[PDB]
């Protein structure tokens, strides 16, 4: 399962590089509905072929997410827990979208003081097509 591995270590990237946008920081100090973290983690999302890529606070409340009306609202999943704590996690679990491997990396202040969590999912059944091949 290199390849799982592989597809893990991808998402993680992704979500690293999320952790340390401006806006994203900036717009954890606004209402969820008007961050401007949906428009970017929505391109992001498409070009690295992930599932969804779900930006949260300190209480786990979505500021982005492929359905525009969980934004708002908490996380559903009990692995982004371990991230809310300052650590990464990778799991296998599912909120509201097909099942998936997902990671989770978190998102500090500029005194690396936590102040949220970037989540990246990769729909389970591509991960097994892509270790058909």
Same mark, same amino acid.
């Given at each position: 399962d290199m390849t799982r591995?592989?597809?893990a270590n991808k998402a993680l990237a992704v979500a690293? @590089?999320?952790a340390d946008s401006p806006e994203i920081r900036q717009g954890? #100090?606004?209402?969820? #509905?008007?961050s401007g973290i949906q428009?970017?983690?929505e391109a992001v999302r498409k070009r690295n072929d992930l599932l969804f890529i779900v930006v949260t606070d300190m209480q786990s409340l979505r500021y982005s997410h492929p359905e525009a009306q969980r934004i708002g609202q908490?996380?559903?999943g009990d692995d982004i827990l371990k991230?809310?704590?300052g650590e990464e996690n990778v799991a296998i679990n599912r909120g509201f979208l097909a099942q998936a491997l997902r990671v989770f @990396?978190?998102?500090y202040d500029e005194?690396?003081? #936590?102040?949220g969590v970037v989540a990246i999912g990769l729909e389970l059944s591509r991960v097994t097509q892509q270790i058909n091949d």
């Open positions: 591995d592989g597809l690293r @590089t999320l954890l #100090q606004k209402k969820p #509905q008007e428009a970017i983690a908490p996380f559903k991230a809310l704590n @990396t978190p998102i005194n690396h003081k #936590q102040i």
